[PDB]
Amino acid sequence: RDFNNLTKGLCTINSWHIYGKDNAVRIGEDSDVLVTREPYVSCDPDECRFYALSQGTTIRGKHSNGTIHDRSQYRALISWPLSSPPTVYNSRVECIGWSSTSCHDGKTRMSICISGPNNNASAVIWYNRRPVTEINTWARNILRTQESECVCHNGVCPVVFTDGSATGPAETRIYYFKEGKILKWEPLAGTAKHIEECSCYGERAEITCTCRDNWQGSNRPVIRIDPVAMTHTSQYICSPVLTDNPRPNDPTVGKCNDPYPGNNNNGVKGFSYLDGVNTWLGRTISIASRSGYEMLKVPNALTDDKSKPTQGQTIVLNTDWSGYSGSFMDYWAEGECYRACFYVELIRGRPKEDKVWWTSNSIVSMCSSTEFLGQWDWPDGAKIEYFL
Amino acid sequence: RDFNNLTKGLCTINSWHIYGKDNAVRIGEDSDVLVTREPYVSCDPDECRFYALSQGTTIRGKHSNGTIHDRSQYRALISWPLSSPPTVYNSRVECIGWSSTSCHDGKTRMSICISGPNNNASAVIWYNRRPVTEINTWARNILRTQESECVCHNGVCPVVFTDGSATGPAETRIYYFKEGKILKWEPLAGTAKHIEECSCYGERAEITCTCRDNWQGSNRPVIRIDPVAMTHTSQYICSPVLTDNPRPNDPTVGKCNDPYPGNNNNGVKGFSYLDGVNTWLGRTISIASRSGYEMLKVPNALTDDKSKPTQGQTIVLNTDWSGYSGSFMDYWAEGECYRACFYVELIRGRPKEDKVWWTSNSIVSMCSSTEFLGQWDWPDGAKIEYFL
Amino acid sequence: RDFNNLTKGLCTINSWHIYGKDNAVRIGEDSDVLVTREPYVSCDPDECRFYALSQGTTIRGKHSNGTIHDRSQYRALISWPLSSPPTVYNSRVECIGWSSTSCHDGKTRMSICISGPNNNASAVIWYNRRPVTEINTWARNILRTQESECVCHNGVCPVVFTDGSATGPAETRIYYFKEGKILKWEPLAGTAKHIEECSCYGERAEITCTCRDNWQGSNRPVIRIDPVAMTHTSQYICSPVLTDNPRPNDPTVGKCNDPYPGNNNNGVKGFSYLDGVNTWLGRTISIASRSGYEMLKVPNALTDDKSKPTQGQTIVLNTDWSGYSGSFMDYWAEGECYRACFYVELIRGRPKEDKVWWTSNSIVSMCSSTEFLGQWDWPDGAKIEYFL
Amino acid sequence: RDFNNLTKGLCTINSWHIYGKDNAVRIGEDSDVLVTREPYVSCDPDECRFYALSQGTTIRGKHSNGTIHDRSQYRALISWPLSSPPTVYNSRVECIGWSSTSCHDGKTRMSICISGPNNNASAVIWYNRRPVTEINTWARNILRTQESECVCHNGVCPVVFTDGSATGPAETRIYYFKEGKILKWEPLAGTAKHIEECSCYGERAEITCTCRDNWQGSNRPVIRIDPVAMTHTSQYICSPVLTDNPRPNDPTVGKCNDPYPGNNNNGVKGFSYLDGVNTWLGRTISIASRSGYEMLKVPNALTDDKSKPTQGQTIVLNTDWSGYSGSFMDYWAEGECYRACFYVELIRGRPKEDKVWWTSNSIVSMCSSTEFLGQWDWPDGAKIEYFL
Ligand SMILES: *[C@@H]1O[C@H](CO)[C@@H](O[C@@H]2O[C@H](CO)[C@@H](O[C@@H]3O[C@H](CO[C@H]4O[C@H](CO[C@H]5O[C@H](CO)[C@@H](O)[C@H](O)[C@@H]5O[C@H]5O[C@H](CO)[C@@H](O)[C@H](O)[C@@H]5O)[C@@H](O)[C@H](O[C@H]5O[C@H](CO)[C@@H](O)[C@H](O)[C@@H]5O)[C@@H]4O)[C@@H](O)[C@H](O[C@H]4O[C@H](CO)[C@@H](O)[C@H](O)[C@@H]4O[C@H]4O[C@H](CO)[C@@H](O)[C@H](O)[C@@H]4O[C@H]4O[C@H](CO)[C@@H](O)[C@H](O)[C@@H]4O)[C@@H]3O)[C@H](O)[C@H]2NC(C)=O)[C@H](O)[C@H]1NC(C)=O
Ligand SMILES: *[C@@H]1O[C@H](CO)[C@@H](O[C@@H]2O[C@H](CO)[C@@H](O[C@@H]3O[C@H](CO[C@H]4O[C@H](CO[C@H]5O[C@H](CO)[C@@H](O)[C@H](O)[C@@H]5O[C@H]5O[C@H](CO)[C@@H](O)[C@H](O)[C@@H]5O)[C@@H](O)[C@H](O[C@H]5O[C@H](CO)[C@@H](O)[C@H](O)[C@@H]5O)[C@@H]4O)[C@@H](O)[C@H](O[C@H]4O[C@H](CO)[C@@H](O)[C@H](O)[C@@H]4O[C@H]4O[C@H](CO)[C@@H](O)[C@H](O)[C@@H]4O[C@H]4O[C@H](CO)[C@@H](O)[C@H](O)[C@@H]4O)[C@@H]3O)[C@H](O)[C@H]2NC(C)=O)[C@H](O)[C@H]1NC(C)=O
Ligand SMILES: *[C@@H]1O[C@H](CO)[C@@H](O[C@@H]2O[C@H](CO)[C@@H](O[C@@H]3O[C@H](CO[C@H]4O[C@H](CO[C@H]5O[C@H](CO)[C@@H](O)[C@H](O)[C@@H]5O[C@H]5O[C@H](CO)[C@@H](O)[C@H](O)[C@@H]5O)[C@@H](O)[C@H](O[C@H]5O[C@H](CO)[C@@H](O)[C@H](O)[C@@H]5O)[C@@H]4O)[C@@H](O)[C@H](O[C@H]4O[C@H](CO)[C@@H](O)[C@H](O)[C@@H]4O[C@H]4O[C@H](CO)[C@@H](O)[C@H](O)[C@@H]4O[C@H]4O[C@H](CO)[C@@H](O)[C@H](O)[C@@H]4O)[C@@H]3O)[C@H](O)[C@H]2NC(C)=O)[C@H](O)[C@H]1NC(C)=O
Ligand SMILES: *[C@@H]1O[C@H](CO)[C@@H](O[C@@H]2O[C@H](CO)[C@@H](O[C@@H]3O[C@H](CO[C@H]4O[C@H](CO[C@H]5O[C@H](CO)[C@@H](O)[C@H](O)[C@@H]5O[C@H]5O[C@H](CO)[C@@H](O)[C@H](O)[C@@H]5O)[C@@H](O)[C@H](O[C@H]5O[C@H](CO)[C@@H](O)[C@H](O)[C@@H]5O)[C@@H]4O)[C@@H](O)[C@H](O[C@H]4O[C@H](CO)[C@@H](O)[C@H](O)[C@@H]4O[C@H]4O[C@H](CO)[C@@H](O)[C@H](O)[C@@H]4O[C@H]4O[C@H](CO)[C@@H](O)[C@H](O)[C@@H]4O)[C@@H]3O)[C@H](O)[C@H]2NC(C)=O)[C@H](O)[C@H]1NC(C)=O
Ligand SMILES: *[C@@H]1O[C@H](CO)[C@@H](O[C@@H]2O[C@H](CO)[C@@H](O)[C@H](O)[C@H]2NC(C)=O)[C@H](O)[C@H]1NC(C)=O
Ligand SMILES: [Ca+2]
Ligand SMILES: [Ca+2]
Ligand SMILES: [Ca+2]
Ligand SMILES: [Ca+2]
């Protein structure tokens, strides 16, 4: 095998088709499904898999009580077959910890997990299912990473980490790994003022990451990485179609180089595909809560501070719970272009459904079509009442 | 690997032997078996598997309530090892949706799933476990396909779809796929007046599909496809041995080019092998309900409007529930001829057994023998009382 | 791969060491273990597996009620990894039916299952996991076979079948299969008067089968097969160490060419290794019930009508339940000789433990050592009280 | 494949990073997890796995009652994927018995299990998943071995066994195996006075084993093996940092060539890495019970009878239960040096938690880093109250 190179551009996105769905919470009502959160999807050359952070308990298990909590010693990055649920018996542990990323370089996979207490966390970088490098916290405040796949080019796999405050300036670093070793790292540059939970995709030798400015911004920061030069830029999505959550109502003009204000110290992981007129943004439908999900075609969102939607697709109704969302692509598919894909985490349980003591999720995932397909909505589908 | 070619004829069918049986409902009374319906069987060059549409819940799970319903966001095409039950832990999701087909071309497998609301459904065509093509509804009324395997010849895999009314003229199309791409499609031609749920098999470079005329016909429509020319014909089975369900009692003379009347707006998926004097038809034993199943040797059923049985085999007694049935063959077996095989879906639960709130099925499957073997009957075997 | 040839002799048997044990009934008290009976062991070139006839239900499942019964539509030959229990999720179905054998020829595996009602049973012979040949009942009375592995030589795999009475003369046939096809079959010849449930092993181009004379004999019949000539002989084990069950107490002189009388119309499957002074016989310890199990070294048992034990090994105490026993070897092991192995089926439940409504078993298996090893006893280990 | 050679030295150990954790007791509260104890970790060239001795029951199973007991017929050496729990469905049985070791030689794996009653135990040596050699008890008193991985060099895999008293002189033997055959064995030599449960690692053609002197010593005996010459030495760790349990408080000067006294007839399996100034010792934090676990950097512990810690890392708080600990390395990793790894068995249940009737464990495992990483603590994480 050779290292994959990002040689193709994005396919034209005219709609989104269903790719995978695991129905995990429905199935886990009466089967040995692990409690998870922070899911994503990532492809190897011969298979695509679901990934997430386990909570080290099943959902009917008594240890599900307390699983609203993000960071414990009982979490691990797990992967499992596409559209199956994450069960005790089919889930492969990639590494231990409570913040992760993972990506295949064309030869093998790199997985990164961070663990530790808040003031003394460390990342372990695994390559070919063996630990290779470790990175200690630099700011002693919840060293943390993407929670979705990284992207590689000719073996170089950039990863974005943050360490420091979630409610003020933090120390974001872009590490460039190859075979699990650090080639270089850079501090964040550009005009993004705070970065968390980057969602990345690659095309024609450039990696684009759409992130969460938890501190100030209801527009999303965008990091664009050149994995050959190992350099990057940052800015915000300029569009007034604001895509964090919670957020204020949409303005008529957005901000390119600073956080669009109105909501502080909160957010949600999300994503976009930024490709000129072939630009699609995801967001929650609710401005207040992690409810609903929609895709909006917003031509030139990155650069046009008045850009508005020209097309859209509902993914999850506003009467159903959503969650984190992120990008992935199958870089090893046939054809002339890369097909944009994404997932949405469908969070069930706490805090919004507090008649149960757990928090878990299921996954829905879609990829782009060049057809203009009909739309359905894709809720989690479980009845909370059944768990009482 | 090369693409498989349909170079062989059918083996002489002198009786049927047991091939597979999953006992899913029996086993699922106390194990994590998924609720399914619309099962089938399909072979790869190195393995044969069971397939079905999951309902995204186990049968003891509380979400089994409601699973009489055909179309939800929680359904998927799954496959699993021959004669195992479809469990949470052993079932591989092929694609998401509520109407499917799947077939191996000798190189890899194509799977097709349709999802969406009734007025805005779309098919996704997967090849080599990746999405390749999508097709939007053309009639905005439950785009739907075979619910059993397709057949390929030199890479060309025809698939029959219908969109439109179930109780009047609809828009049936035969798509010819290769490597998941559309080579051509044709509207239905010939004298079949309504088509659903085609059951297909191939022999000497011709594909024969036996279908369901839900609107008018208690004889079954037959589509015969030339996958090289990519053309087809349609007619009905001429025989007065009527094989849909519900149906009127058998006449003495059938109809070749129009629906044999008496029952409207209903049916069941079924199949036949039409090979001159080596012709066998399956049907339910009951004329009124999906009860029993039998195979009848009906020489020249396709073309002889007075043909009657010369031999038969009971598969399921009329005191046991049946369901859909369909054809498959192992195109990669050794020997000089293709051995005809079929399955019967053994439906349990609603609507006929309404003391439970679910609907599920198990599978029995048989293939032909050149011996004249003794017959057994093959019920599902579960006791509904145990589920109360 | 080439066909395996029986080129080696037996290793010297100086004691028996533990090979595998599945603890199935213990584990199945709280896990999804299938109800089984009639287990055995068989090796492929790269793996050894446990085999048995499933009852198509788990042991905690309500459908376990009734599983004392031998023949139903819900049985299948299953295999699973050595020393694991036979679970819903890890068990591979080989074929459907209620009497089986299976063996690897060095290239691939042949499996045979018989199904049907008592008066109309049929065998299906699978090779390379595909059905190849079928054989209809010839006597219309429970066509039945070995219930342990067959043995192959240069592709020729003899199998012993019986059809007819269990309590008087029956029609036993030795079929010689190659690639699942019938080369030849012979009726039983020699002086054995009734044959069931043969337990076979091969060495230096000869296959030895030790069987059950259910009608009259408490000595066991022995069939010796030349798989090159495709001919056989039969006789009884001459030794007065009688090894069927139930049986009379041991005499001082046995019978070579007729059944040793005293017990009629009953028996148990069992085995022996007959190799001159390297001869070991297994038997139940109890003369009355399937209780205990022991191995006795009985030099020249086959030919010496006064032969008595010179050494022994207790396998299962007489205060624990046993069951069927049979031979297998790993024909693909390293070294200069074939190591004799056997299993014992440890039957739990009905009829001897009738406070539960099921019948199931676990497996213990041992192979020979050239050391004189210490002995343990190997009970099933489950507490029936836990199942109430 | 060629046999692995121990060509590399140890990596510099500046801290320990998380490697694996299975959360077995947490997950097994509501999933089919086997009861285990005596776990370890061992790598093949393409995978690392967890190993342990099953008790032949799940933890919620009623047969979990009594599993404080060390030796029964229902135990087996099992392996399963790294960081998964040992479940009924994912656990591979390596061999049957109640004392084990296992190691890969670069070509295939050798596994050794001992079974039998106390006065008549025997070891079976498996190679390439087949039994090859057997060894009968020589002292008729609980023949027993390492309970963690062995190490191979050019095919030669030394294993340490003991047979005899646990509370006075016993008969320890070092067997040198190749392809599962005995090349040689030696009686223990040197100044260690009692040996059990050796924990081994290899580097630059030498194997170092740190063991348990159950009889007298609260310092640990160390056996150093030359696998080319097939010779060994023994002594004790000289350091006054005493690392058995229970033990007296730490002195200022230890003992090189005799047991450091104060505690008799007890101990725990443990380990060390002895590499000059790159020397790390593990131990329980409690001097009295199997509570807590810590790593201490104790330069020249082996040879310096006043050596004290210069650095350390807490693995398990003293308010959490620990257990056995042992060494392993991935001899097939990339790079210039072998990375030291270890595990800790986190024992739950009896005798310390006697409100439940079972004894089981989970596993945490770590490997060395050349960074100075932040430390977390890694408890089992289960709530005993949930099991009542
Ligand atoms: C079967 O499945 C089919 C496929 O899925 C399905 O069809 C799909 O239907 C859905 C639902 O209708 C469609 O999705 C929507 O698409 C809208 C965009 O399309 C409309 O607008 C464009 C653009 O129109 C402007 O620009 C063009 C030129 O490019 C001009 O030509 C126009 O005149 C117009 O110009 C004015 O405005 C511009 C600036 O905005 C100026 O530049 C300009 O000078 C003028 O001022 C049109 O081109 C479209 O028409 C074409 O398509 C339609 C078919 O849809 C045809 O009938 C027609 O012939 C044309 O071909 C079309 O009119 C999205 O706007 C829309 O998303 C908004 O609404 C939803 C709620 O429905 C919100 O959730 C979403 O967030 C968007 O609204 C919010 O955000 C915006 C942006 O800030 C706010 O302005 C807005 O107020 C609202 O904010 C509020 O909610 C927010 C969210 O909660 C909150 O955050 C805010 O704070 C605030 O509270 C939606 O995505 C989809 O595209 C169809 N797809 C296809 C292929 O057709 C079909 O229905 C199904 N069938 C059945 C039977 O069910
Ligand atoms: C061990 O296992 C063995 C293997 O399984 C098992 O043997 C099998 O037994 C079963 C059960 O008996 C057999 O299955 C049946 O087979 C019947 C056909 O075979 C009979 O008929 C043929 C044909 O006979 C005509 O034609 C030949 C020439 O080809 C002439 O020679 C004849 O004289 C006769 O001619 C007249 O009729 C023709 C028109 O029909 C005219 O052309 C002609 O001029 C004359 O008018 C015979 O050849 C057969 O004989 C041979 O075999 C038998 C052995 O079976 C030997 O004894 C004998 O020597 C010969 O070798 C034989 O007589 C099927 O018809 C039958 O299926 C009908 O019945 C079942 C109920 O049993 C129905 O469920 C089924 O649907 C069929 O009936 C319905 O449908 C027809 C068609 O429309 C209706 O006419 C009929 O009224 C009925 O309709 C009703 O029910 C429907 C369903 O609910 C409903 O929809 C309707 O609306 C209506 O309500 C059945 O399949 C099987 O073949 C055996 N197999 C073998 C290899 O032997 C054995 O028993 C087992 N042992 C034990 C101990 O258990
Ligand atoms: C640690 O583990 C160790 C390894 O496992 C374990 O050692 C093992 O111990 C077990 C138990 O003791 C041993 O197993 C038994 O072995 C017996 C055979 O060995 C004895 O006999 C031989 C043969 O002796 C005759 O022949 C030789 C020459 O070859 C002469 O030298 C002798 O003098 C004697 O000759 C007379 O008899 C012959 C005819 O029978 C004539 O030919 C001759 O002229 C004379 O008349 C001796 O060689 C043996 O000695 C050697 O070994 C011992 C060690 O065992 C040493 O001390 C000694 O120095 C020698 O080296 C030895 O004496 C088996 O017979 C025995 O099986 C019978 O008993 C059990 C019950 O225990 C029954 O279950 C079993 O079925 C057998 O009895 C039944 O069947 C026979 C046959 O028909 C009947 O005769 C008998 O009455 C009984 O029938 C009844 O029960 C049946 C079953 O229910 C029922 O069906 C009947 O109807 C009836 O009701 C048993 O297998 C084993 O071999 C040891 N292994 C080793 C390697 O040592 C050790 O104990 C463990 N340690 C601890 C501490 O636990
Ligand atoms: C984020 O994560 C970080 C990384 O994990 C974490 O940092 C880590 O913190 C932990 C906890 O503090 C550190 O772990 C401890 O490390 C201690 C060793 O380090 C100290 O000592 C050395 C050595 O000092 C001597 O020698 C040097 C020269 O080599 C001289 O320079 C010194 O002056 C001193 O010399 C005297 O003593 C010598 C003999 O002992 C003589 O030779 C000499 O002449 C003098 O007499 C220092 O070098 C270290 O300083 C350096 O590092 C610190 C940072 O830690 C810096 O601040 C500093 O600038 C330097 O760079 C340092 O001072 C271990 O001793 C310690 O383990 C003992 O304590 C724990 C309890 O905490 C016990 O559980 C453990 O068992 C050890 O104590 C027992 O055993 C000893 C030995 O017998 C007994 O003496 C002792 O009494 C006690 O016994 C009792 O308990 C036993 C167990 O129950 C029982 O069995 C006995 O019977 C008895 O009851 C511990 O491991 C770790 O190393 C840090 N790591 C790093 C990289 O920094 C950081 O905190 C985290 N951040 C947050 C915010 O949480
Ligand atoms: C099915 O028939 C096709 C058409 O003849 C065979 O296709 C040829 O395959 C050869 C061998 O791979 C190629 O080099 C030719 O170029 C192919 N020809 C065409 C016209 O496509 C194919 O091999 C046949 N399949 C099998 C299993 O034999
Ligand atoms: Ca924000
Ligand atoms: Ca109809
Ligand atoms: Ca008998
Ligand atoms: Ca000690």
mmCIF file with all atom_site columns, C-alpha atoms in Angstrom, chain A residues 17-19 21 23 26-27 29-32 45 83-85 87 89 330 332-333 339 369 371-383 386, chain B residues 32 34 55-58 60-63 65 71-75 88-89 91-93 96 98 115-117 120 122 124 126 130-136:
data_model
loop_
_atom_site.group_PDB
_atom_site.id
_atom_site.type_symbol
_atom_site.label_atom_id
_atom_site.label_alt_id
_atom_site.label_comp_id
_atom_site.label_asym_id
_atom_site.label_entity_id
_atom_site.label_seq_id
_atom_site.pdbx_PDB_ins_code
_atom_site.Cartn_x
_atom_site.Cartn_y
_atom_site.Cartn_z
_atom_site.occupancy
_atom_site.B_iso_or_equiv
_atom_site.pdbx_formal_charge
_atom_site.auth_seq_id
_atom_site.auth_comp_id
_atom_site.auth_asym_id
_atom_site.auth_atom_id
_atom_site.pdbx_PDB_model_num
ATOM 1  C CA . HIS A 1 17  ? -28.538 10.249  0.917  1.00 0.00 ? 17  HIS A CA 1
ATOM 2  C CA . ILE A 1 18  ? -28.617 7.932   3.887  1.00 0.00 ? 18  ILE A CA 1
ATOM 3  C CA . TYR A 1 19  ? -25.277 6.211   4.510  1.00 0.00 ? 19  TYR A CA 1
ATOM 4  C CA . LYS A 1 21  ? -27.643 4.505   10.989 1.00 0.00 ? 21  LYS A CA 1
ATOM 5  C CA . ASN A 1 23  ? -30.369 2.579   16.005 1.00 0.00 ? 23  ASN A CA 1
ATOM 6  C CA . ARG A 1 26  ? -33.508 1.373   20.351 1.00 0.00 ? 26  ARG A CA 1
ATOM 7  C CA . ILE A 1 27  ? -31.541 -1.853  20.123 1.00 0.00 ? 27  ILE A CA 1
ATOM 8  C CA . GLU A 1 29  ? -33.051 -1.242  25.306 1.00 0.00 ? 29  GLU A CA 1
ATOM 9  C CA . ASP A 1 30  ? -32.752 -5.065  25.268 1.00 0.00 ? 30  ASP A CA 1
ATOM 10 C CA . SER A 1 31  ? -29.241 -5.957  24.068 1.00 0.00 ? 31  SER A CA 1
ATOM 11 C CA . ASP A 1 32  ? -25.685 -5.381  25.325 1.00 0.00 ? 32  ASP A CA 1
ATOM 12 C CA . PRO A 1 45  ? -9.151  1.363   2.386  1.00 0.00 ? 45  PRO A CA 1
ATOM 13 C CA . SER A 1 83  ? -24.496 0.705   11.019 1.00 0.00 ? 83  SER A CA 1
ATOM 14 C CA . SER A 1 84  ? -24.223 -1.930  13.684 1.00 0.00 ? 84  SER A CA 1
ATOM 15 C CA . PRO A 1 85  ? -24.662 -0.657  17.260 1.00 0.00 ? 85  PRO A CA 1
ATOM 16 C CA . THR A 1 87  ? -21.954 -3.632  21.519 1.00 0.00 ? 87  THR A CA 1
ATOM 17 C CA . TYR A 1 89  ? -19.129 -8.099  21.732 1.00 0.00 ? 89  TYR A CA 1
ATOM 18 C CA . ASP A 1 330 ? -14.203 7.622   1.876  1.00 0.00 ? 330 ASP A CA 1
ATOM 19 C CA . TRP A 1 332 ? -10.617 5.106   -1.161 1.00 0.00 ? 332 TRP A CA 1
ATOM 20 C CA . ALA A 1 333 ? -13.790 5.054   -3.184 1.00 0.00 ? 333 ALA A CA 1
ATOM 21 C CA . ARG A 1 339 ? -18.088 12.277  -1.860 1.00 0.00 ? 339 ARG A CA 1
ATOM 22 C CA . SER A 1 369 ? -25.570 12.764  -4.068 1.00 0.00 ? 369 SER A CA 1
ATOM 23 C CA . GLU A 1 371 ? -29.076 13.802  -7.716 1.00 0.00 ? 371 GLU A CA 1
ATOM 24 C CA . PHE A 1 372 ? -31.676 15.987  -6.078 1.00 0.00 ? 372 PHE A CA 1
ATOM 25 C CA . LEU A 1 373 ? -33.100 13.337  -3.807 1.00 0.00 ? 373 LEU A CA 1
ATOM 26 C CA . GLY A 1 374 ? -36.153 13.372  -1.675 1.00 0.00 ? 374 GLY A CA 1
ATOM 27 C CA . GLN A 1 375 ? -35.602 13.972  2.038  1.00 0.00 ? 375 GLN A CA 1
ATOM 28 C CA . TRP A 1 376 ? -36.637 12.008  5.102  1.00 0.00 ? 376 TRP A CA 1
ATOM 29 C CA . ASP A 1 377 ? -35.912 12.796  8.705  1.00 0.00 ? 377 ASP A CA 1
ATOM 30 C CA . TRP A 1 378 ? -33.802 10.399  10.787 1.00 0.00 ? 378 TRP A CA 1
ATOM 31 C CA . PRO A 1 379 ? -34.467 10.407  14.499 1.00 0.00 ? 379 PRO A CA 1
ATOM 32 C CA . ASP A 1 380 ? -32.884 8.176   17.052 1.00 0.00 ? 380 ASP A CA 1
ATOM 33 C CA . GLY A 1 381 ? -36.207 6.333   17.368 1.00 0.00 ? 381 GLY A CA 1
ATOM 34 C CA . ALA A 1 382 ? -36.043 5.111   20.960 1.00 0.00 ? 382 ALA A CA 1
ATOM 35 C CA . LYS A 1 383 ? -38.884 5.622   23.484 1.00 0.00 ? 383 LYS A CA 1
ATOM 36 C CA . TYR A 1 386 ? -39.296 2.008   27.822 1.00 0.00 ? 386 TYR A CA 1
ATOM 37 C CA . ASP B 1 32  ? -30.751 -10.907 21.082 1.00 0.00 ? 32  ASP B CA 1
ATOM 38 C CA . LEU B 1 34  ? -33.436 -8.691  15.578 1.00 0.00 ? 34  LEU B CA 1
ATOM 39 C CA . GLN B 1 55  ? -36.750 -3.393  12.221 1.00 0.00 ? 55  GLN B CA 1
ATOM 40 C CA . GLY B 1 56  ? -33.979 -1.949  14.384 1.00 0.00 ? 56  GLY B CA 1
ATOM 41 C CA . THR B 1 57  ? -35.050 -3.690  17.593 1.00 0.00 ? 57  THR B CA 1
ATOM 42 C CA . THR B 1 58  ? -34.833 -7.136  19.102 1.00 0.00 ? 58  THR B CA 1
ATOM 43 C CA . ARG B 1 60  ? -37.965 -9.246  23.215 1.00 0.00 ? 60  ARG B CA 1
ATOM 44 C CA . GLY B 1 61  ? -37.186 -5.551  23.142 1.00 0.00 ? 61  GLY B CA 1
ATOM 45 C CA . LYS B 1 62  ? -39.918 -3.127  23.934 1.00 0.00 ? 62  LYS B CA 1
ATOM 46 C CA . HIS B 1 63  ? -39.402 -1.445  20.563 1.00 0.00 ? 63  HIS B CA 1
ATOM 47 C CA . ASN B 1 65  ? -44.214 -3.094  19.543 1.00 0.00 ? 65  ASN B CA 1
ATOM 48 C CA . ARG B 1 71  ? -41.591 1.423   6.514  1.00 0.00 ? 71  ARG B CA 1
ATOM 49 C CA . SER B 1 72  ? -39.652 3.270   9.149  1.00 0.00 ? 72  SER B CA 1
ATOM 50 C CA . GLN B 1 73  ? -36.348 4.998   9.590  1.00 0.00 ? 73  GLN B CA 1
ATOM 51 C CA . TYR B 1 74  ? -35.157 2.103   11.763 1.00 0.00 ? 74  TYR B CA 1
ATOM 52 C CA . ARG B 1 75  ? -35.054 -0.551  9.020  1.00 0.00 ? 75  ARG B CA 1
ATOM 53 C CA . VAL B 1 88  ? -27.547 -7.901  17.021 1.00 0.00 ? 88  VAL B CA 1
ATOM 54 C CA . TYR B 1 89  ? -24.031 -9.237  17.167 1.00 0.00 ? 89  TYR B CA 1
ATOM 55 C CA . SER B 1 91  ? -25.814 -9.170  11.495 1.00 0.00 ? 91  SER B CA 1
ATOM 56 C CA . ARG B 1 92  ? -23.994 -7.023  8.919  1.00 0.00 ? 92  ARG B CA 1
ATOM 57 C CA . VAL B 1 93  ? -25.810 -3.973  7.670  1.00 0.00 ? 93  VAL B CA 1
ATOM 58 C CA . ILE B 1 96  ? -30.402 1.533   5.275  1.00 0.00 ? 96  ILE B CA 1
ATOM 59 C CA . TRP B 1 98  ? -37.225 -0.517  3.847  1.00 0.00 ? 98  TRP B CA 1
ATOM 60 C CA . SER B 1 115 ? -35.704 4.787   2.045  1.00 0.00 ? 115 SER B CA 1
ATOM 61 C CA . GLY B 1 116 ? -37.756 7.889   2.557  1.00 0.00 ? 116 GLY B CA 1
ATOM 62 C CA . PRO B 1 117 ? -41.336 8.916   3.104  1.00 0.00 ? 117 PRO B CA 1
ATOM 63 C CA . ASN B 1 120 ? -40.162 11.166  -1.615 1.00 0.00 ? 120 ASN B CA 1
ATOM 64 C CA . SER B 1 122 ? -34.955 7.173   -3.077 1.00 0.00 ? 122 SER B CA 1
ATOM 65 C CA . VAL B 1 124 ? -29.108 4.004   -3.058 1.00 0.00 ? 124 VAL B CA 1
ATOM 66 C CA . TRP B 1 126 ? -24.055 0.193   -3.197 1.00 0.00 ? 126 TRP B CA 1
ATOM 67 C CA . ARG B 1 130 ? -19.756 1.736   -1.034 1.00 0.00 ? 130 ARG B CA 1
ATOM 68 C CA . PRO B 1 131 ? -22.572 3.927   -2.309 1.00 0.00 ? 131 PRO B CA 1
ATOM 69 C CA . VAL B 1 132 ? -22.281 4.527   -6.067 1.00 0.00 ? 132 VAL B CA 1
ATOM 70 C CA . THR B 1 133 ? -25.608 5.674   -7.581 1.00 0.00 ? 133 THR B CA 1
ATOM 71 C CA . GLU B 1 134 ? -28.848 7.095   -6.302 1.00 0.00 ? 134 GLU B CA 1
ATOM 72 C CA . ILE B 1 135 ? -32.303 7.104   -7.946 1.00 0.00 ? 135 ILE B CA 1
ATOM 73 C CA . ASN B 1 136 ? -35.099 9.387   -6.848 1.00 0.00 ? 136 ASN B CA 1
#
